């Protein structure tokens, strides 16, 4: 069976060792001869949101993605800094506004939502983001939508995880329910985890410091854990 | 958040080294102080379906489960032998009939389906099993149903996997659709994998030779990969 799309789902890189942990993964997938349509990094890109760490991340990852002709999709995590990421990763003017973005890969919509709260480890989605997201999803994409965020909308199966979890999930669920979101890609957790949120599959990739392969079929989305 | 149920999902033990790979996992979870309601083993219990290997498996696992007061749930895999498993694992009269079973854990239904084909590595579900399964699911369980089988009803993301995959999945899907099956537990693959089948979450546990924790919440089922 040939997939419609192939995505790479990497998370929690924590760059400031994390340098060659990520380095060796890149080449391992380069050497596997895999050619994904997109590489999605679901947060905690930089451990202390450092300019130097973003620069370094960009030099390591951009060549890798260009070779495979793959779209790079960056997501804000709790440890990141919105302004330094915009500045040193995206070549955009600095702003503390949520890193929310829409990205079409042929017929597939990828939506990047920012669940980060500046200077806080927990997760939240602000009213303006739910409005933005609702408006966007009112138009169905041909091959449906992948949602990429940091803090996963799933129950916390550990206590030291509850204080840093994504808050007010009911609001998100009200917006996602009945739309064309087919899968939710998330990070934060540091162990591979899957569940559903309002009927939608949630897949959380483990920390880098393995990752997930994502094959998008016409009728299903397959997530596989690569050690 | 307190889960309604906790399940342990272990797969592909391949006992005939596999002995102390499984041994060290048991104790690691014994030592974690985890107390699951059920331990579900999703096939390839014995590598050559050997009487000696079932005896050994039983001596290693039954004490472990009794301590935690956990229900043992055994599933036929491709490598198993229906008659020797019935004989040396279940203390049942030998039979080549599919190992199909229903098991209530308080309000939660667990259904064991046998996708094995004797002397063959591929997977199939026979007409009589679809009838049995349909009849059973006509009655909803209070806390819905977990389905446990060997060959997962998900697309094969590798070629050397297609010849051994579960065949005629459309038939299964016709039976599962709209019933109270909340999750499908599966094995066979040897890499952690999740997808949906007819809207239902499928979670495949990796080979032992790690496993999965399964927390069953009122509104969702969370699967986590334990290295
Ligand atoms: Fe992190
Ligand atoms: Fe196996
Ligand atoms: Mn995080
Ligand atoms: Mn198998």
UniProtKB/Swiss-Prot annotation, chains A, B:
Binds 1 Fe(3+) ion per subunit. Binds 1 Mn(2+) ion per subunit. GO terms for biological process: cell wall modification. GO terms for cellular component: cell envelope; cytoplasm; extracellular region; peptidoglycan-based cell wall; plasma membrane. Coiled coil: none annotated. Keywords: cAMP, Cell membrane, Cell wall, cGMP, Cytoplasm, Hydrolase, Iron, Manganese, Membrane, Metal-binding, Nucleotide-binding, Phosphoprotein, Secreted. Its EC number is 3.1.4.16, 3.1.4.17. Its cofactor is Fe(3+); Mn(2+). Changing residue 12 to A: 90% decrease in bis(pNPP) hydrolysis. Does not affect cAMP hydrolysis. Strong decrease in interaction with the cell wall. Changing residue 190 to A: 80% decrease in hydrolysis of 3',5'-cAMP and bis(pNPP). 40% decrease in 2',3'-cAMP hydrolysis. Strong decrease in interaction with the cell wall. Changing residue 47 to A: 25% decrease in bis(pNPP) hydrolysis. 70% decrease in cAMP hydrolysis. Decreases interaction with the cell wall. Ca(2+) acts as an activator of the enzymatic activity and is able to promote the hydrolysis of substrates even in the absence of transition-metal ions, thus providing an effective strategy for the regulation of the enzymatic activity. Two Ca(2+) ions bind at a site different from the dinuclear transition-metal-ion binding site. Activity is enhanced by magnesium or manganese. Activity decreases in the presence of orthovanadate and phosphotyrosine. It is found in: Cytoplasm; Cell membrane; Secreted, Cell wall; Cell envelope. It catalyses: a nucleoside 2',3'-cyclic phosphate + H2O = a nucleoside 3'-phosphate + H(+); 2',3'-cyclophospho-AMP + H2O = 3'-AMP + H(+); 2',3'-cyclophospho-AMP + H2O = adenosine 2'-phosphate + H(+); 2',3'-cyclophospho-GMP + H2O = 3'-GMP + H(+). Disulfide bonds: none annotated. It is an enzyme of class 3 (hydrolase). Phosphorylation does not affect the enzymatic activity, but it renders negative charge to the protein, promoting its localization on cell wall. Homodimer. The C-terminal extension (CTE) is used to better adjust the substrates into the active sites and mediates in vivo subcellular localization of the protein. It also modulates expression levels of Rv0805 in mycobacteria. Cyclic nucleotide phosphodiesterase with a dual-specificity for the second messengers cAMP and cGMP. Can use 2',3'-cAMP, 2',3'-cGMP, 3',5'-cAMP, 3',5'-cGMP and 3',5'-cUMP. Hydrolysis of 2',3'-cAMP produces a mixture of 3'-AMP (major product) and 2'-AMP (minor product). In vitro, is 150-fold more active in hydrolyzing 2',3'-cAMP than 3',5'-cAMP. Can also hydrolyze the model substrates p-nitrophenyl phosphate (pNPP), bis-(p-nitrophenyl phosphate) (bis(pNPP)) and p-nitrophenyl phenylphosphonate (pNPPP). This is cAMP/cGMP dual specificity phosphodiesterase Rv0805. It comes from Mycobacterium tuberculosis (strain ATCC 25618 / H37Rv). The lineage of its organism: Bacteria, Bacillati, Actinomycetota, Actinomycetes, Mycobacteriales. The chain holds residues 10 to 265 of 318 of the full protein.
């Amino acid at each position: 069976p040939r997939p419609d799309y192939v995505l790479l789902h990497i998370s929690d890189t924590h760059l400031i060792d994390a340098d060659d942990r990520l380095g060796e993964l890149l080449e391992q997938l380069n050497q596997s001869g895999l050619r994904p349509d997109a590489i999605v990094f679901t947060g905690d890109l930089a451990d202390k949101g450092e300019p130097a760490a973003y620069r370094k991340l960009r030099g390591l990852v951009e060549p890798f993605a260009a070779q495979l002709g793959a779209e790079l999709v960056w997501v804000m995590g709790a440890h990141d800094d919105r302004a330094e990421l915009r500045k040193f990763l995206l070549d955009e003017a600095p702003s503390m506004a949520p890193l929310d973005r829409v990205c079409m890969i042929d017929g597939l919509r990828i939506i990047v939502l920012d669940t980060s709260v500046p200077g806080h480890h927990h997760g939240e989605i602000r009213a303006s983001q739910l409005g933005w997201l609702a408006e966007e999803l009112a138009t169905p994409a041909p091959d449906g939508t992948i949602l990429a965020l940091h803090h996963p909308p799933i129950p916390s199966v550990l206590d030291m995880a509850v204080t840093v979890e994504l808050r007010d999930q009911a609001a998100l669920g009200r917006v996602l329910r009945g739309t064309d979101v087919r899968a939710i890609l998330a990070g934060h957790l540091h162990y591979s985890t899957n569940a559903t949120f309002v009927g939608i599959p949630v897949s959380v990739a483990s920390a880098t410091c393995g990752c997930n392969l994502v094959h998008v079929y016409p009728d299903t989305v397959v997530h596989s854990v690569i050690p």
